[PDB]
Design a protein around this ligand. Structure first.
Ligand SMILES: CCC1=C(C)/C(=C/C2=NC(=C\c3[nH]c(/C=C4\NC(=O)[C@H](C)[C@H]4CC)c(C)c3CCC(=O)O)/C(CCC(=O)O)=C2C)NC1=O
Ligand SMILES: CCC1=C(C)/C(=C/C2=NC(=C\c3[nH]c(/C=C4\NC(=O)[C@H](C)[C@H]4CC)c(C)c3CCC(=O)O)/C(CCC(=O)O)=C2C)NC1=O
Ligand SMILES: CCC1=C(C)/C(=C/C2=NC(=C\c3[nH]c(/C=C4\NC(=O)[C@H](C)[C@H]4CC)c(C)c3CCC(=O)O)/C(CCC(=O)O)=C2C)NC1=O
Ligand SMILES: CCC1=C(C)/C(=C/C2=NC(=C\c3[nH]c(/C=C4\NC(=O)[C@H](C)[C@H]4CC)c(C)c3CCC(=O)O)/C(CCC(=O)O)=C2C)NC1=O
Ligand SMILES: CCC1=C(C)/C(=C/C2=NC(=C\c3[nH]c(/C=C4\NC(=O)[C@H](C)[C@H]4CC)c(C)c3CCC(=O)O)/C(CCC(=O)O)=C2C)NC1=O
Ligand SMILES: CCC1=C(C)/C(=C/C2=NC(=C\c3[nH]c(/C=C4\NC(=O)[C@H](C)[C@H]4CC)c(C)c3CCC(=O)O)/C(CCC(=O)O)=C2C)NC1=O
Ligand SMILES: CCC1=C(C)/C(=C/C2=NC(=C\c3[nH]c(/C=C4\NC(=O)[C@H](C)[C@H]4CC)c(C)c3CCC(=O)O)/C(CCC(=O)O)=C2C)NC1=O
Ligand SMILES: CCC1=C(C)/C(=C/C2=NC(=C\c3[nH]c(/C=C4\NC(=O)[C@H](C)[C@H]4CC)c(C)c3CCC(=O)O)/C(CCC(=O)O)=C2C)NC1=O
Ligand SMILES: CCC1=C(C)/C(=C/C2=NC(=C\c3[nH]c(/C=C4\NC(=O)[C@H](C)[C@H]4CC)c(C)c3CCC(=O)O)/C(CCC(=O)O)=C2C)NC1=O
Lengths: 162, 66, 228, 49, 160, 162, 162, 160, 162, 160, 160
C-alpha cells in the first residue's frame, strides 16, 4: 500500500530530490499524530465486535426493513454477510487511520465495491448509513481527538460508496 | 510438534495408467503438523495404508514453541 | 433488459482479469467507468471454454479432468524423478514459476530452499506450489494491492487453472479471506478435492479453462481470425 | 446547459450567436440548436465519443 | 515503512495489529525526530560523501577506472557517482521510513538484472556502498552512525 | 435452480407469511402434474441417445454445409462438441420440465451462452434449428401432453438464444 | 482527433523540445505519402458502396446463418444495421488512412464498441471477418501500396474489436 | 508439426530453443523433401487407393453393405468412401507435418462419439484403415512404407 | 500454435482439398529456409543478452528520461521489467521466425498487450522504439538473409503495439 | 517471542534479519527491565486482581451465577476464577515474551471450540477479561498500565 | 548423448522410441568417427586454443589483469587458463556425446553462483569462450566447425 511517510518518499523519488524543509515538516506532522493513531488503533482493536454490534443495531433500528422479510439483510446468510462487510469496513478504516493515508481504502475496498453492490442488489444508501453508524459509534469510544481522525476515513468510505 | 515423517502406500482403484507411478503409490515424506490431519484423512480416503509416522523436527508436548 | 445474463463475474465485469501470461490487469471504476453490473444470482454457474479437448469439460464429462491429454491441451509438467543431475526437475521448477506467477522471478526473489527440497524429494510438486503461492513475494504481487475479490479471482485462476463458476466458490473464498487471510484462501484452494483429482502431488497446475473474453483476446487478432 | 459548464472559464464563446440571441434575431431554441451544431460542441462532445 | 510492514502483516492474516506491532510503531514514532536529524545531516553532506566515497572506491578498486574497466572515462565515472547519489538518497529515505522498504522497492528489486544489463560489477557496488558507509558514519555521531550503518549494511548485503 | 414448490416457498417467505389456501392450491396443481412430468422425464432419459441421433441427422440433412469442410461442425472434435451441446439442451430441458420452472435455463444454460458461441464462432441459428429438431423428435416419443409441456422449455431455449 | 503531424507536434510538446532532425524526417515521410493517401481516399470514396456490397456478399455467403431466421442479421432492419456498421468501418478506415494515425479509430469507433456488441449480441468474430473481407476487396481497387497502408488500419480495427 | 512441438516446449519453460531441439528441427527440414515426395505420391494415387480399399473392406465385411448394414445403399456407401478419403487426406497432412498432430486434431479427437452417434461400427473403421494401409504400402516404395505405416497404425490404434 | 506447415494444412483442410502443386511449392519454400531459420535462432539464443544490452542502451540513449527520476523505467524494479519485456519480445520473435508464422505473437504476446500497457502507463511509442532497436541490433548479428526474416516479426510486434 | 517471530520471518525468505527486525529486537530487549517488573507486579497481585475481576464480572453479568447460567453454583464459580487465573498467567507470559504468542499457543488457538464444548458464553469471557484489564491497570503505573492494557486488549479481541 | 535424450523423452511420454528417433540415433552413431576426429583435433591443440583465447580476452579486458583485477598475477592468470582448459575439455566431451548435457552437468549448473563466490566476471567468461570459439572453429573444416560453434555458442549463452 502507501502511507504518509511512503507518500512523501514517493513524491520526492519521482521528483528525484533529497528531502527539503516541507518534507520534514510533513514527516514531523505524521510523527506528532502517530501516538494518537496508535492509541485509537488499540482502542478499536479491543472493541471491534462491540462497535460492529451497536452500529448494526442502530442501522437496523433506523431502517427496520432490512432485517424484516423482503429486506436485503433478511436471512441468516445475508445478515452475516452484512456484518462481515461492516467488519471489513472497520478494519480497513483502522488500517487507513493508523497509516495516515486512504490508499488502502481505494485499493482493497473501494475499487470494485460499487459494481459488486449494484450487481448483488445491496442498497448503497443503507450501506453508507451503516458506515456513518460505525463512525458515530466509534467516535465515542476513541475520544474526540481520535474521533476527528477516524471520521475522515469513515467519510472517505462513505464518499467512495456514494 | 513440527514435522511428521510418514510412510504410505496408495494403490490404484479408479484406473490403470501406463506411466511411471511407483513414486506416487509408495512414498515416504515429511508433512507439517497442521497439514498432517488433512493429509492423513486424504490418504485414508484414497484407500491408502499408513505404515509408520515419526516425530522429526519438533518435540512432543510443547505448550509453546510450536 | 431483454437478454439473458452475460458471461461475467458475479461481482461485475471489472472483476475479470485480462487473461495474459502475467500481470493481474483489471478494469478500474475511476480511470474510466466502463462498468456493467448484472443480476447474477448466488447459484448461477458460468460457462467456461476448455483449453483443450472440447468434450472434456466437467459439465458434460465429470471424469473429463482425468482424461488423456490431446495435442490441444497445454504442456503438462510431472515430476517423476524418483520422489526420494536431472534437467527435468529444473524444467518443472520453471514451469511452476510460470504458472504461479506467470513469469520467472528475479534472482533475489527465488524460493531457493523450496527448490532444494524439491530437487532432493523432501517435498512434492504440490508442496512446492504451496510454498510459491504462500510466499511473501506472491502476496506482494497479487494480494495486497487489489480489491479482495479481484485477488481471489486471480489467485484461483493461477492455482486451479480456471475461473470461478459462480457465487458459491467466490463466497466461500471471500469468507475464507475474512476469517483466515491470504494464506487461508491459498491453502483452501490447494486443499480442494478438485485440485487433488486434477493436479495430484505430481503435476504442476496448468490452465484448463478460459472465459470467452480471454479466447476473444487471442482468436480475434487479425492474424488469428479464421479467413473466410 | 449545452457544454455542461461555463466555457468562459477558457475564454471560449460564439460572439455572433450571443449577439443574435440577445438582440432577438434568433430565439433561445435557435440559439441552443446553433450552439450544439457549432465547432465548439463538435470538439467537446462529438469527436471524443 | 514500519507502519506499512506492520499493517500488511496484519492484513495478510485478516486481523488487527498485535500489541507488539503497536509497540513497535510507538517506538518508531518516538525515534522519528532523531531519524529526521540524521536524514538532514546526510542530505546536507551529500556532495562531500559522494566525492570521498568515489575516491576511496577507485583507490581500493583501481581496475574499475583502469582501461577496459566499467568506470573508465569521465562520463562513466560521472554515472558511477550518480548511482552513489541515488543510493545515498535511498538511504535517507530508509532512515526516515524506519525500514529498508523504500531502499528495497526503489533500488534493490531487480538491481542484479539492471547491472547485468549495464556490465556493472556487483562487487564494485559492494565496495562503493562500504565506502559511502565509512564516509557517512565518519560524519555522524556514534548513535547515528549505528543506525546509518545498519542501512548501508542492508544495501551492501543486497548488492552482494 | 428453483422449482414450483421452491418458488411458492420463496414468494411466501419474502412476505413473511405462513401458507394459506392459495399456496396449497398451487402446490396441489404441481403435485397433480408431477406424474406426467416423471413419466416424460423417464421416457426422455431412456431414449436420449435416439433423440440426439435423430435430431442431429435432421439438422445436418437440412444444413449439410455444417458437416462439410468449412462448416463449424467439420472435424471429429467439433461434431462431438455439437452432439454434446444437443445433449446439454435435452438434459436441461428434462430438468426444467421436471422442476416445472425455467429458472435452470436462465441459471445453468443461457447465461453467457450467446457470448460463448460468438467467441467460438458457433452458428446461433443452426443451434436453434437443432433445438427444434430435438423438440419435434421428443414430442413424438413423449406424447401430446408431455410434448405440450416440454415445448415451453424448448421454445424458451430457442428464444433465449435467438 | 490526432494525425501524424499532430502526433509529432504533441510528442514534441509534451517534452517541451523544439523540432529536431528526427521529427522533420517523420513529417517529411507523412508529406511524401500524402499524395498516395489522397488517391486512395478518392478511390475508396468513389467505390465505397461496391466494397460494402462485395464484402457483405462474401461474409453472408461464407456464413449463411447470419441472415437466416435466428441470425443476428435476420430482418431488413438488422441486415441494414449490419451493412451500416460495415459502411462506418470502411469510412473510418479511410479517415485513418488519410490522417496517417489511428487516433480517430480509437476515440470515434472502438471506444465502447466491443461492450456495445456484447450487450447487443453481435458476433464480433463475424464482424472481424467482414472487416477482413473489406480489406481484401479494397486492396484490389487501391493497388499494392495503398492496400498495405489501408490494411494497416483494417487490421487495427480488427484487433481493436478483439 | 515438429517445429511447433519444439517451440511449444521451449515456450512452456520460457526459454530459447536448446541446441538439441534445434538439431531436431534441422533433421525435420532435411527430411522435408522426401516426405513431400511421399505425400505427393499418396495424393496422386488417391482414387486408386480409395477404390481398392473400399472393395477390399466390403469383401472382408459383407454385413456393412448388406441390407440392414450401415453402408447399405448408394448414398451410404458413398459416405463410407468419402470418410476413407478424409482419412487418406489426413495421412498426407500428417506426412507433410512430420507428426500425427494434424490427424489427431482433424480426425481423431472425438471420433468415437461421432461414430457412436452415426451408428458407424468402429471395428469396420479399423479394418478400413488397415486395408488402406495395405494398399498404400503396396503402392509406394519399401523405405517410405514404414513412414506411411507409422501414421496408418496411429490412426488404427486411435480408432480402436 | 500454428506454423507455416500447419497454416497450409489448415487452409487446405478447411477447403477439403488435397495438397496441389501450389501447396507443395509453399511447403518446399518453407523447407528451403529451414537451415537459415535454425542458424538464426541459434545465433539469437547465443547472443540474446548482448542484443538486449545494446538495444536497451540505444533506447535509453535516445530517451534518457525513461531511466531518470520520473521516467517509467526509473527504479531497479521498473528497469528490470523493461529489460524483461524486451527479452520476451526477442524470444517470441525468434519463435515466430522459426515457425515462419506470426500466430504465436498474436496468441501469446499481443493478446491484450496494448491495453495492458495503457492500464500500466507504459509508453507504447518508446516500446516500439525499443523493438526497432532490437531489430536493427539483431540484423547485424544474424546476417542480412536472417535479418530480413527477423524484421517482419519485429514489425509485426511493433504494429501490434502501435 | 519477538526474537522468535523475527527469526521465523527472516528464515521464511531464506535471508538474514533486516535492520527493521534488528531494530524491533533491540527495542524489545532494551525494554526488558520495564516489562519484567510489570510482570512481577502482576504476579505478586494474584488474588486481588482475580477476586475483583470476578466481582465485576458477576455484578455486570448477574445471570452467569443465576440458576440456569454457566457459572451457577460454587464449583462453577471456582472454575470461572481458575480460568481467570489462567488468562492472567498467560498475560504475564505474553508481557515478558514481548508478544502475544504464548497466549496464542496456549490460550487463544482453539479457545472457541473449547468454550463451546464447555457451554461457556464468549461475551462472558470478554467481560471477564475486560474486568481483569480494569483491575490490573488500576494497580500499575501510568506508563506500565498501557503496556498491560494492550495485551488485555489482544486477549479480549481474541475471545470475542 | 542423443540416445539419452531420446530415451528420456520416450520414457516421459511412456512409449517405445519412435521410428524417427531411431533414424536420429542411427544418424548419430554412423557419424561417431567424425566426432572422434573433431575431439582429437581439439585435444591436440589445447595450448594454442587456450592461450590465444586468454590473450584475446586480456586484450579486450586489460582491467582483469590490472592491479586489483580478478586475474591479476601469474597464479590467478594460470587459474584463468585452467578454467578455459576445463571448458575446452567439456566442449570435446559434448562433441563426442552429441549434445550439451555433459557441459550442463559439469560446467553450467551453478556456474553463476560459483563465479560470484570467486568474484569472477561472467562477461569475462563469455568473452573468453567466444575467443575459444574463434580459435577452435578455424582449426576444423566447415561442417565440423559449424557443429563445434554450436557448442561454443551454447556455452557462451549459458554463461551470460
Ligand atoms: C428467518 C431467519 C432469521 C432469523 C432466525 C433471524 C434472527 C434475528 N434475531 C434478532 C434479535 C434477537 N433475537 C433474540 C432471541 C434470543 N433471545 C434469547 O436469548 C434466546 C437464546 C434467543 C431465542 C430463543 C433476541 C432477544 C433478540 C434481540 C436482541 C437485541 O435487541 O439486541 C434479529 C434482529 C431484529 C431487528 O434488528 O429488528 C434477527 C434478524 N433473522 C432472520 O432473517
Ligand atoms: C474487502 C473488500 C470487499 C467487500 C467489502 C466486499 C463486499 C461483498 N458483500 C457481499 C454480499 C452482501 N453484503 C451485504 C451487506 C449490505 N446489505 C445490507 O443490507 C447492508 C445495508 C449492507 C452492509 C452494511 C449483504 C446483505 C450481502 C448479501 C447479498 C446476497 O446474498 O445476495 C459479497 C458477495 C457474497 C455473495 O453473495 O456470494 C461481497 C463480495 N467484497 C470485497 O472484496
Ligand atoms: C515403470 C516402473 C514401475 C514399476 C516396475 C511398477 C510396478 C507396480 N505394480 C503395481 C501393481 C500390480 N502389479 C501386478 C503384477 C504382478 N501380479 C502377479 O500376478 C504377476 C506375476 C505379476 C506381473 C507379471 C499386479 C497384479 C498389480 C495389482 C495390485 C494389486 O491389486 O495387488 C504397482 C501399484 C499400482 C499402481 O500403478 O498404482 C506398481 C507401482 N510401477 C511402475 O511405475
Ligand atoms: C449447458 C450450458 C452449456 C452450453 C450450451 C455450452 C456450449 C459449448 N459448446 C462448445 C464447443 C462447440 N459447440 C458446437 C455446436 C455447434 N456447432 C454446430 O454448428 C451446431 C449448429 C451447433 C450445435 C447444435 C461446436 C461445433 C463446438 C466446437 C467449437 C470449437 O471447438 O472451436 C463449448 C466450448 C468447448 C467446451 O469447453 O465444452 C461450449 C462451452 N456449454 C455449456 O456449459
Ligand atoms: C475429417 C474428419 C471427419 C470424419 C471422419 C467424418 C465422418 C462422417 N461420416 C458421416 C456419414 C457416414 N459415414 C459412414 C462410414 C461407415 N460406413 C461403414 O460402416 C464403415 C465402417 C464406415 C466407413 C469405413 C456412413 C455409412 C455414413 C452415412 C451415415 C448415415 O447417413 O446414416 C458423417 C455425417 C455427415 C455427412 O454424411 O456428410 C460424418 C460427420 N466427418 C468429419 O468431418
Ligand atoms: C534509484 C534506482 C536506480 C539505479 C541505482 C540506477 C542505476 C543506473 N546506472 C546506469 C549507468 C551506469 N552506472 C554505472 C556505475 C558503476 N560504475 C562502476 O562500475 C561502479 C561499480 C558502479 C557504481 C558504484 C556506470 C559506469 C554507468 C554507465 C554505463 C554506460 O555508460 O554504458 C544506468 C543506465 C541509464 C543512465 O546512465 O542514465 C542506470 C539505470 N537506475 C535506477 O533507476
Ligand atoms: C508475455 C506477454 C506479456 C507482456 C510483454 C507483458 C508486459 C508487462 N509489463 C509489466 C510492467 C513493466 N513493463 C515495463 C517496460 C516498459 N516501460 C519502459 O518504459 C519501456 C519503454 C518499456 C519496455 C521496452 C515497465 C517499466 C514496467 C513496470 C511498470 C509497473 O509495473 O508499474 C507488466 C505488469 C506486471 C509485472 O510487472 O509483473 C506487464 C503485465 N505482460 C504479458 O503477459
Ligand atoms: C490456559 C488455557 C486454558 C483455559 C482458558 C482453559 C479453560 C477450562 N475451563 C474449564 C471448566 C469451566 N470454566 C468455566 C468458566 C466460565 N464460567 C463463566 O461463564 C465465565 C464467562 C467463564 C470464565 C471467565 C466454567 C463455568 C467451567 C465449568 C463448565 C462445566 O461444568 O463443564 C475447563 C474444563 C476442566 C475443569 O472443569 O476443571 C477448562 C479446560 N483450559 C486451558 O488449558
Ligand atoms: C568443470 C567445472 C569447473 C569450473 C569451471 C571451475 C572453475 C574454478 N575457478 C576457480 C578459481 C579462479 N578462476 C579464475 C578465472 C577467471 N578469472 C577471470 O579473469 C576470467 C574471466 C575467468 C577465467 C576465463 C580465477 C582468476 C581464479 C582465481 C580466484 C581466486 O583464487 O581468488 C576455482 C576455485 C579453485 C582454484 O582457485 O583453483 C574454481 C572451482 N571449477 C570447476 O569444477
Amino acid at each position: 500500500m502507501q502511507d504518509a511517510i511512503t507518500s512523501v518518499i514517493n513524491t520526492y523519488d519521482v521528483q528525484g530530490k533529497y528531502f527539503d524543509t516541507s518534507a520534514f515538516d510533513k514527516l514531523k506532522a505524521y510523527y506528532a499524530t502517530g501516538e494518537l493513531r496508535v492509541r485509537a488503533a488499540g482502542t478499536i482493536s479491543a472493541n471491534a465486535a462491540t462497535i460492529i454490534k451497536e452500529a448494526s443495531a442502530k442501522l437496523f433500528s433506523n431502517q427496520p426493513d432490512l432485517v424484516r422479510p423482503g429486506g436485503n439483510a433478511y436471512t441468516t446468510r445475508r445478515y452475516a454477510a452484512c456484518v462481515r462487510d461492516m467488519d471489513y469496513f472497520l478494519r480497513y478504516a483502522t488500517y487507513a487511520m493508523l497509516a495516515g493515508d486512504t490508499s488502502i481504502l481505494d485499493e482493497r475496498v473501494l475499487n470494485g465495491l460499487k459494481e459488486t453492490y449494484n450487481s448483488l442488489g445491496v442498497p448503497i444508501s443503507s450501506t453508507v448509513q451503516g458506515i456513518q453508524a460505525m463512525k458515530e459509534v466509534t467516535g465515542s469510544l476513541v475520544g474526540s481527538g481520535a474521533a476527528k481522525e477516524m471520521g475522515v476515513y469513515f467519510d472517505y468510505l462513505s464518499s467512495g460508496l456514494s | 510438534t513440527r514435522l511428521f515423517k510418514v510412510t504410505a502406500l496408495i494403490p490404484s482403484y479408479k484406473k490403470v495408467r501406463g506411466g511411471r507411478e511407483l513414486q506416487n503409490t509408495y512414498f515416504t515424506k515429511l508433512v507439517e503438523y497442521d497439514r498432517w490431519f488433512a493429509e492423513q484423512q486424504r490418504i485414508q480416503k484414497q484407500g491408502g495404508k499408513i505404515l509408520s509416522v515419526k516425530m522429526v523436527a519438533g518435540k512432543p508436548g510443547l505448550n509453546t514453541g510450536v | 433488459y431483454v437478454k439473458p445474463l452475460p458471461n461475467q463475474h458475479p461481482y461485475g465485469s471489472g472483476n475479470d482479469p485480462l487473461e495474459i501470461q502475467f500481470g493481474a490487469i483489471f478494469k478500474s471504476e475511476t480511470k474510466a467507468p466502463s462498468a456493467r453490473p448484472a443480476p447474477i444470482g448466488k447459484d448461477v454457474q458460468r460457462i467456461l471454454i476448455r483449453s483443450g479437448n472440447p468434450i472434456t469439460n466437467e459439465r458434460g464429462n465429470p471424469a473429463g479432468g482425468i482424461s488423456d491429454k490431446t495435442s490441444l491441451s497445454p504442456q503438462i509438467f510431472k515430476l517423476t524423478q524418483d520422489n526420494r543431475v536431472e534437467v527435468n526437475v529444473q524444467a518443472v521448477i520453471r514451469a511452476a514459476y510460470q504458472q504461479v506467477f506467470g513469469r520467472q522471478l528475479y534472482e533475489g526473489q527465488h524460493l531457493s530452499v523450496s527448490e532444494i527440497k524439491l530437487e532432493n524429494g523432501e517435498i512434492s510438486v504440490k508442496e512446492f506450489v504451496r510454498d510459491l503461492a504462500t510466499s511473501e513475494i506472491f502476496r506482494k504481487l497479487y494480494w495486497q494491492n487489489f480489491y479482495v475479490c479481484k485477488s481471489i479471482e486471480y489467485i484461483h485462476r493461477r492455482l486451479l487453472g480456471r475461473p470461478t463458476y459462480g457465487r458459491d466458490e467466490t463466497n466461500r473464498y471471500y469468507d475464507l479471506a475474512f476469517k483466515k487471510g491470504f494464506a487461508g484462501v491459498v491453502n483452501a484452494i490447494l486443499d480442494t478435492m478438485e485440485y487433488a483429482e486434477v493436479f495430484g502431488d505430481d503435476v504442476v497446475p496448468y490452465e484448463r479453462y478460459v472465459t470467452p473474453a480471454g479466447l476473444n483476446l487471442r482468436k480475434l487478432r487479425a492474424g488469428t481470425v479464421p479467413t473466410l | 446547459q449545452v457544454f455542461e459548464r461555463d466555457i468562459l472559464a477558457y475564454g471560449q464563446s460564439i460572439s455572433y450567436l450571443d449577439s443574435k440571441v440577445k438582440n432577438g434575431e434568433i430565439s433561445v431554441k435557435e440559439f441552443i440548436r446553433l450552439l450544439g451544431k457549432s465547432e465548439l460542441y463538435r470538439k467537446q462532445f462529438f469527436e471524443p465519443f | 515503512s514500519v507502519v506499512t510492514k506492520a499493517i500488511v502483516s496484519a492484513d495478510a492474516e485478516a486481523r488487527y495489529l498485535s500489541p507488539g506491532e503497536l509497540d513497535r510503531i510507538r517506538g518508531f514514532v518516538s525515534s522519528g525526530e532523531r531519524r529526521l536529524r540524521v536524514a538532514q545531516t546526510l542530505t546536507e553532506s551529500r556532495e562531500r560523501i559522494i566525492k570521498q566515497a568515489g575516491d576511496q572506491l577507485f583507490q581500493k578498486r583501481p581496475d574499475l577506472v583502469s582501461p577496459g574497466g566499467n568506470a573508465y572515462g569521465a562520463e562513466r565515472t560521472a554515472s558511477c557517482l550518480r548511482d552513489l547519489d541515488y543510493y545515498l538518497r535511498l538511504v535517507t529515505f530508509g532512515i526516515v521510513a524506519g525500514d529498508v522498504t523504500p531502499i528495497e522497492e526503489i533500488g534493490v528489486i531487480g538491481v542484479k538484472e539492471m547491472y547485468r544489463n549495464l556490465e556493472v560489477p556487483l562487487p564494485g557496488m559492494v565496495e562503493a556502498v562500504k565506502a559511502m558507509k565509512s564516509v557517512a558514519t565518519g560524519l555522524l555521531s556514534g548513535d547515528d552512525s549505528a543506525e546509518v550503518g545498519y542501512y548501508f549494511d542492508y544495501l551492501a548485503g543486497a548488492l552482494a
